[model samples]
Target: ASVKVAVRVRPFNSREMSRDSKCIIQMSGSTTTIVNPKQPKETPKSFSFDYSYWSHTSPEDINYASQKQVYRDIGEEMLQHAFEGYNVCIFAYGQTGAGKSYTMMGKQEKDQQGIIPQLCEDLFSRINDTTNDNMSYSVEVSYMEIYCERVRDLLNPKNGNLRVREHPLLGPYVEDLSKLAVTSYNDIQDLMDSGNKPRTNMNETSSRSHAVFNIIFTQKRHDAENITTEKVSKISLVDLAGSENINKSLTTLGKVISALAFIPYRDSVLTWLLRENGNSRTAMVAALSPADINYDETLSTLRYADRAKQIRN
Candidate 1:
């Protein structure tokens, strides 16, 4: 049987930093210091976290914490609610290179922080710490990236072999990874590293493509009386494409605006997302394919993840 699902959207917040101002990201137990390039030589200058406004660079200002600290601060509430048998999804959405990748997948080096790594850590730890005599939690995780509307398995070195399918329950999701398993934090970390290794070739750190981390949580129990059979719950962490303004900067994105105007064979991914559930239900909550990343294929993959889900009873 398939599972039931509920959807929620978390809008992005914008904060600004000026020259000589400090931006602090208190992550994990350890604080990481991100000194603004503009203010590298000085102490705290006046700055504001204006989620409502945008600036030239929203530099990270961190102190006494790891990237994990940042994610935990936001995800803690959701995980706490998970104890009640609800599967929760935490995602990082923004335009290309807008630190979306960094927010979702931490730096590959050890002690670096990211939402995926942190979530895996906390979930497993909680599972291990709890003694549900009648229940057991097992996690399964997979990483994939969407480039130009195509899905590629992050674990595999090769590209463009995977296909997107209409999810049995979640609108659309990749059908591969049916054979994968998640046993512990080490297992998840290994999988993440395998995927991370291939991405080094790409100029931008983190994933230049829209990467989706699917984590399946299963509770095993025999009628809630003994740890026998397992019941399943699933959650996802999606890092969206970065918003690139070629109009303002042209160094990396060559002729992005030209493609946006002339590219017809290629469809915008964000456009598809904003499409309502059906014709009758027209007002779009979010663009299926938005111009956030400005690339056609990248936006499509993001739209797919936004609408996709898998629920199991």
Candidate 2:
């Protein structure tokens, strides 16, 4: 059985301190050039996000959990949910370099923390406490990256550019997380480190690529004794790439350099979410108009974390 829940992590580009330790976040500007729809024929040359003129404002619609509650201290709450046999999805959502990775994966500096590490520590502790004659707990993990609109298995270097297709059973599926075999928590952690691709130094200590890290937990009941408590739990930890400012930053040149760059960036993310290839194939493809981009492949493996939260719910 599968269950769903929501956990709203905080945005990035801020500062915090824990006892003698201190950390700071530096943010890049969001000067996304939004072509004006009002002037459809005008080419939208001047309709840029104009970050230079606009003030850098912080969003406060959602409150942030304290470092302890979200991280080191979150062990109990997560365990409670997991033991209940629910499909828990925890994501770090925001603009690039906004601490999405740090919030989910943590920073490199001392006293820095991340949900992935904390969860791992808690999970192993829980497993260690359990002793069973007829039941056993198993965890399998898989890592993949969506680059240039192609699905590449991070763990399988040879597995490259597999097109995303509709699944007869699981709606639309790309790499099969349920099929990968992972035995221990440490094994899963190893895959994460191996699959991670570092972003440009602009963000310094942040992840660059959009990575989908999934852990599938299975409880096997050897006999009728543990059947009631046995279940397969799935937890997807995503640290999405920060949305870069193409207007003021050098990344604009980067994209321009790769005009043929197939890396899938959403028009507004609304299109990305609503365009579910499995449910409404036509509706999904129509979302991308004028420019003939491969929404099918891009959408399948994109793993839009925010969008994924809604899809699962």
Candidate 3:
């Protein structure tokens, strides 16, 4: 139904810490500001979005943003859209190691889970609530990765080169992609446990692969006669390739800007799969690093996030 834009800033890593890099990122409310450590007099770039996460410092800070807070702001909101029968997608974009995966899928075995896991937990909560016994809900899920313009089913990697075909009614469908029915959170959890192993290894190769996790949810309402009425919704979670390697030089930003230009491009599989219908609720989370070393690309992500804020539908 709409496009919501958000950006998050993460703390410095060993690379930044060893060199004594300053935090070029600053957030006041939903606005993000960054300064180039190389340039002293230049005005610091500032931009705002629907949501901003200041996870750059200590947890004790009053403005610190936690994983649960992110779920509340972005993940839960998108799940509500799905509950209302809208197809929704939330994709994170930025350079490598900028908290993209961290925001979408946190450590699988850890206490701090990311948006996808949190949303799944909440989805089960609403579905299992005793207050809505008359309603029926069913889920089917699929996971795939797009690397170098080729799509591979994460669940069934043995089947290669999944074709993305268009249907007059179905919009765009990935032919031969595995869609496994899920009865509980554990059901999907089992699928993820199996799918994630090869994916992490694939990502390790070049770090420029787009992984999409999808859930097709259907809900039914029956009258006393036991006849069924139904509405089906879709949820798409995309962990995009790192923005840095799109081209050795100026290519990556150009590609994203073209999509934010909103035509995207039919040639690109990742963007094509997402432009399913203009009617869907789509959102972007631009993750950023707080270090000065990444000021240039981080600024690019900020501008990207800012341009996305103007998109409607």
Candidate 4:
């Protein structure tokens, strides 16, 4: 229920390995330490987190953290919050190729499947295990992306740069975005990420664009007497852009929630749409790579996430 923050380090790729990049990332219990390969004499920057996953090594390693293990620690807990009738969200932040999508949306393999797919399957499995004649469930799913500071519907590519409006009573919401009512996750999946559209991405939008997948789940149950109770919980799973400075440096956040600040949500669309996030239970995962070349970015990512660690919601 408290602020859940975790860090994950992934393995080296061919490019880094080809350059013989030294592994500058280290983990001792829940603390993650990153060294500067250039200046070994200087003490490394160390930060503590709720949980640190050392996935930089192979599965055969004694302390390796696998995809399934990460889900068991995070995805399972996030799912229970929904069944408990509280809105839950998981927002991811990292540089490109640091394992943001790799951790949130995984490859199409048995064990490679990421948190989104795992959460989908688990939601259905829970419903099936606890369904009754008196109980019913409904879910509305939507997928959206923020590319070049413009909003685009992934489910419906035809709509580009949709408008965002704030309701007097509903906080902030997107206008004209497509929403699909479905009975299962496949209804959420096959319709999502299955098409090959020729737009403007060359498998490099992970840094330029941000992805947010939302699931609005509603469950209704009637007692034998006659009374009916309904519970609604929204789940927002986000994959942030690689360029952290673009969103954070705008100085849009922290101020909006402050009384001394002016309302500028319209100017910064990214933080504006999710204005309600400060009121919900959330988690921020900082995906990282240990290559020396990423020293500057790695430090920036650390401070951003560390400050997040200091905030209470």
In the order shown, the candidates' Cα RMSDs to the true structure are 11.8, 12.9, 2.7, 3.0
Model 3, span 12-128: residue lDDT tens: 888889999898898898888888889968998788788888999856787888888988988999899899999888888888899988888877764578888888888988888
Residue 27 CA displacement from its true place in model 4, Å = 0.6
For model 1, the stretches where C-alpha displacement exceeds 4 angstroms are 1-66, 108-110, 167-171, 177-179, 200-202, 205-208, 223-231, 245-313
Across 3-32, the per-residue lDDT of candidate 1 in tens digits comes to 111111122233222122232321122211
Question: For residues 54-94, could you state the per-residue lDDT of candidate 2 as single tens digits?
Answer: 11222222322343445543334545566567555554444
Taking all chains together, the TM-score of candidate 4 against the true structure is 0.90
Write candidate 4's Cα lDDT for 50-115 as tens digits.
878899998789799888888888888888888888787787777778888888887777688788
Superposed model 4: Cα runs more than 4 Å off: 195-203, 244-267
Give the lDDT ranking, best first.
3, 4, 1, 2
Leading candidate by lDDT: 3
Computed on alpha carbons, the lDDT of every model, listed in order, comes to 0.44, 0.42, 0.79, 0.75
Q: Return the TM-score for each candidate structure.
A: 0.55, 0.53, 0.91, 0.90
Candidate 1, residue 147: how far the Cα is off, in Å: 0.5
| Model 1 accuracy (lDDT, Cα) | 0.44
Best by TM-score: 3
Model 4's lDDT to the true fold?
0.75
How high is the lDDT of residue 152 in model 3? Answer: 81
Q: Kindly report which residue stretches of model 3 are placed more than 4 angstroms away from their true locations once superposed.
A: 200-205, 245-264
